[PDB]
Amino acid sequence: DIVMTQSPSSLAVSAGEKVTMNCKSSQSLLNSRTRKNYLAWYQQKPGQSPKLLIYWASTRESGVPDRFTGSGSGTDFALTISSVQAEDLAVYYCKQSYNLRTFGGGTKLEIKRADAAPTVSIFPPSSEQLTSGGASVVCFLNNFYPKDINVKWKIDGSERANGVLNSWTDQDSKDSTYSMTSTLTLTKDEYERHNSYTCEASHKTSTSPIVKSFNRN
Amino acid sequence: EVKLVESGGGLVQPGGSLRLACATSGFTFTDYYMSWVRQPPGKALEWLGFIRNKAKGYTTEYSASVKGRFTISRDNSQSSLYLQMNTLRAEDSATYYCARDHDGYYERFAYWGQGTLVTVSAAATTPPSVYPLAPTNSMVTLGCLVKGYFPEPVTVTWNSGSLSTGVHTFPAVLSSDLYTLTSSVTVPSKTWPSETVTCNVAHPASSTKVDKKIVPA
Ligand SMILES: C=CCO[C@@]1(C(=O)O)O[C@H]([C@H](O)CO)[C@H](O)[C@H](O)[C@@H]1O
Ligand SMILES: [Zn+2]
């Protein structure tokens, strides 16, 4: 029976920097007949299917950039990325095939980039939703770094924090940013009792919040 | 050219059964083992079983976690693979992948399909409501709010795919058994609203196709 641990669970590296992730087997995956290690690496990009990178531990698959090197033997294996590109954002899986197949838990690779401020957009409920009796107010915080970020919703100057759901995107594969959406949901009636709607974005890129507002006007 | 396509995914009640299919093309089917792999959202891949090729007489192997509960079979006249799933539970909820496996030489899952998502829930299929997000700068940002559907997934495009860059689709969040997500699109303020912008949203669970034009407020 074969147990695959992977290490680390996650890390972030800057473009150009080097990257090593590890793969432990509970037993040797060396087939003495073929003298090969039955160990493969898969890259799985956000939203995408797993793609093959390396098989037999060391063998790189066609199309795969040379910056990707698979190493090791026995019970210890490693995927090295020599000069990381933004496109390299993904979870990497090792998998043995010496005794059926077993995947490791994965190494999630994030990219480090310079801090960048969010572009913030606010949107009032559509009249379609309203006539149906609901009021969702939505706020986009796009293309910022780093991920950590706080949103404040304020109605007529007072912070409401119920009815608010937040959602972050995977990191962007090109520009290495993150975007976040924040939706405050109210009944139409409650929405109609108030005048000013404000999305307040607090990010380390500025001591001052980014402030987008609309009036039910 | 090699193709693998999974189908059959969607909502099944707990205790229920479901069979998935995997249609293939562009390679010699009977030469290959074929594998099924799953992945609970935000989680690791898990190999579940294969059925060997023609050389080994199309025998099946299973991971201990589904051995006895899941069944694999292939139709060699059609280049098609199946996974029969019984007595489903919540932890069976996951994207399911067919993958081309062993052929006699290489130890690699050379190709994978797009995957099909299976949700095991007593909750009921609910079609989404789709709302326009309409709003100064040189770029302008629009959105569509896809609210209250079940189960996952939905797809969002902008102008039937012809608007691909500057698009952020946010991961759905769950609440009272309804998912909610948004997609933002950023275009030159030059172009809107002089040029129509429309989101195209699909929810296969409910055969829902929605087009929504973003019209100025
Ligand atoms: C004679 C071939 C055996 O192949 C299989 C098989 O079919 O069972 O067994 C191989 C083992 O190395 C044999 O000791 C591999 O795991 C291979 O991928 C496959 O699972
Ligand atoms: Zn057997």
A178-187: strand order across its sheet: A119-123, A134-144, A178-187, A164-168
A67 with A127, same domain: the answer is no
Distance from CA of B157 to the nearest CA of A (A): 14
Q: Is B162 left (phi over 0), alpha (psi -120 to 50) or beta?
A: alpha
SS (H, E, C) chain B: CCEEEEECCEEECCCCCEEEEEEEECCCHHHCCEEEEEECCCCCCEEEEEECCCCCCCCEEECCCCECCEEEEEECCCCEEEEEECCCCHHHCEEEEEEECCCCCCCCCCCECCCEEEEECCCCCECCEEEEECCCCCEEEEEEEEEEEECCCCEEEECCCCCCCCEEECCCEEECCEEEEEEEEEEECCCCCCCCCEEEEEEHHHCEEEEEECCCC
Residue B80 CA to ligand 1 center (angstroms) comes to 22
Q: Which range marks the domain in which residue A36 is found?
A: 1-113
A108 with A127, same domain: the answer is no
What is d(CA B97, CA B65) in angstroms, rounded to the nearest whole number?
17
Q: What is the dihedral of CA B26, B30, B32, B35, to 10 degrees?
A: 90
What is d(CA B78, CA A215) in angstroms, rounded to the nearest whole number?
61
Breaks in chain B (C–N > 2.5 Å) following residue: 135
From A81, A113, A145, the end of a domain falls on: A113
What is d(CA B104, CA A164) in angstroms, rounded to the nearest whole number?
55
A101–chain B Cβ distance below 8 A for any pair: yes
State whether A61 and B108 contact (CB < 8 Å). yes
A79 with A170, same domain: the answer is no
Residue that is written with structure tokens 């898990």 in the block:
B46
From A113, A130, A159, the end of a domain falls on: A113
Q: Coil, strand, or helix at residue A100?
A: coil
| Closest alpha carbon to A39 in A48, A26, B192, B164 | A26
Which of the four CATH numbers 3.90.320.10, 3.30.70.20, 3.40.640.10, 2.60.40.10 does domain B123-216 have? 2.60.40.10
A138 with A38, same domain: the answer is no
B6-30 per-residue burial string, b: 16 or more CB within 10 A, e: under 16: bebbbbbeeeeebebbbbbeebebe
A90 with A137, same domain: the answer is no
A179 with A85, same domain: the answer is no
A121–chain B Cβ distance below 8 A for any pair: yes
Q: Is B206 left (phi over 0), alpha (psi -120 to 50) or beta?
A: alpha
Ligand nearest to the CA of B61: 2
Residue A201 CA to ligand 2 center (angstroms) comes to 58
Experimental method: X-ray
| Closest alpha carbon to A197 in A141, A134, A139, A140 | A139
A101 with A140, same domain: the answer is no
A141 with A207, same domain: the answer is yes
Resolution in A: 2.4
In this structure, the number of other CB atoms found within 10 A of the CB of residue A211 comes to 13
Radius of gyration, alpha carbons of chain B: 21
| Closest alpha carbon to A11 in A103, A144, A112, A115 | A112
B32–chain A Cβ distance below 8 A for any pair: no
Contact by Cβ (8 Å): A174, A111 = no
B107–chain A Cβ distance below 8 A for any pair: yes
- The CATH number of whichever domain residue A105 belongs to comes to 2.60.40.10
From A97, A113, A129, the end of a domain falls on: A113
What is d(CA B155, CA B186) in angstroms, rounded to the nearest whole number?
18
Where helices occur in chain A by DSSP H, the ranges are 127-131, 188-192
Domain count, chain A: 2
| Residue A49 with chain B: CB contacts under 8 Å | 97, 112-115
- Cβ < 6 A, ligand 1 pocket: A 31, 97-98; B 52, 56, 102, 107
Contact by Cβ (8 Å): B42, B148 = no
A72 with A138, same domain: the answer is no
State whether B170 and A106 contact (CB < 8 Å). no
Parts of chain B belonging to CATH 2.60.40.10: 1-122, 123-216
How is residue A181 written in tokens?
């959406």
B169-172: which pairs have CB atoms within 8 A and are 24 or more residues apart?
B169/A169, B170/A167, B170/A168, B170/A169, B170/A179, B170/A180, B170/A181, B171/A167, B171/A168, B171/A169, B171/A170, B172/A167, B172/B146
Q: Please provide the CATH number assigned to the domain covering B1-122.
A: 2.60.40.10
State whether B45 and A42 contact (CB < 8 Å). yes
